[PDB]
Amino acid sequence: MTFVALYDYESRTETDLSFKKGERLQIVNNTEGDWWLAHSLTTGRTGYIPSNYVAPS
Amino acid sequence: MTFVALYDYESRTETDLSFKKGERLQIVNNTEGDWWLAHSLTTGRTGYIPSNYVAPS
């Protein structure tokens, strides 16, 4: 349930978490699901998506 | 490899993808890994993290 940061990470947006190597992090249960980088074949746009919003096909 | 959007989603940041129900989406292989919502026990801050940057403990 608990994880440790392996590397420093600096936030790029208002929503990501900055952290230093060694921090202890706990995953937050979330209705959105894991986020994935996705490319829309329909529109050609690309960006992160909430995985609970999609299904295989 | 291909997914279908089950719901409309409007972008909240510069990095997420907006899409409409029915779009076909392809996952992009990514060095960052899936993103997770996490709470730092070390700093008390909370936000999304790249899962490849951490390890269980």
Numbering used by the authors:
A (entry chain A), B (entry chain A): 84 to 140
Lines from the paper:
The non-receptor c-Src tyrosine kinase participates in different signaling processes by phosphorylation of tyrosine residues in a variety of proteins, modifying their properties, such as enzymatic activity, subcellular localization and stability. The c-Src tyrosine kinase is made up of six functional regions: (i) a N-terminal fatty acid-acylation domain, (ii) a unique domain, (iii) a Src homology 3 (SH3) domain, (iv) a Src homology 2 (SH2) domain, (v) a catalytic domain, and (vi) a C-terminal regulatory domain. Of all those, the SH3 domain plays a key role in the regulation of the tyrosine kinase activity through the recognition of an intramolecular Proline Rich Motif (PRM) and, additionally, through the interaction with other PRMs present in other proteins. To better understand the mechanism of 3D-domain swapping formation in c-Src-SH3 domain, and its plausible implication in amyloid fibril formation, we have solved the crystallographic structures of the WT and three mutants at position 128 of the c-Src-SH3 domain.
The Gln128Arg mutant crystallizes as an intertwined dimer, where 3D-domain swapping takes place by exchange of the RT loop of two different protomers and the n-Src loop acts as hinge loop (see Results for a description of the structure of the protein). All the crystals of the dimeric form of the c-Src-SH3 domain belong to the hexagonal space group P6522 and show a single chain of the c-Src-SH3 domain. 3D-domain swapping of the polypeptide chains occurs as a result of an open-like conformation of the n-Src loop (Asn112-Gly116) which acts as a hinge loop. On the other hand, in the Q128RD, the longer side-chain of arginine displaces W3, while W1 and W2 are placed at the same position; and in the Q129KD the sole water molecule conserved is W1, which is placed at hydrogen-bond distance of Lys128 and Glu106. Thus, the amino acid at position 128 is responsible for the hydrogen-bond scaffold around those water molecules. All the intertwined dimer structures described at this work show the presence of a PEG molecule at the interface of the two chains forming the dimer. Whereas the WT did not show a large pH-dependence of the Tm, our results confirm that: (i) the mutation of Gln128 to arginine or lysine, which bears a positive charge, results in the stabilization of the c-Src-SH3 domain, since these species unfold at higher temperature than the WT; and (ii) mutation to glutamate, which bears a negative charge, results in the destabilization of the c-Src-SH3 domain. However, at temperatures below 20°C, we did not observe the formation of high molecular-weight aggregates after several days. It is noteworthy that, under the same conditions assayed for the WT c-Src-SH3 domain, we did not detect any aggregation in the Gln128Arg/Lys mutants, even though these mutants were also dimers at protein concentrations higher than 5 mg·ml−1 (0.72 mM).
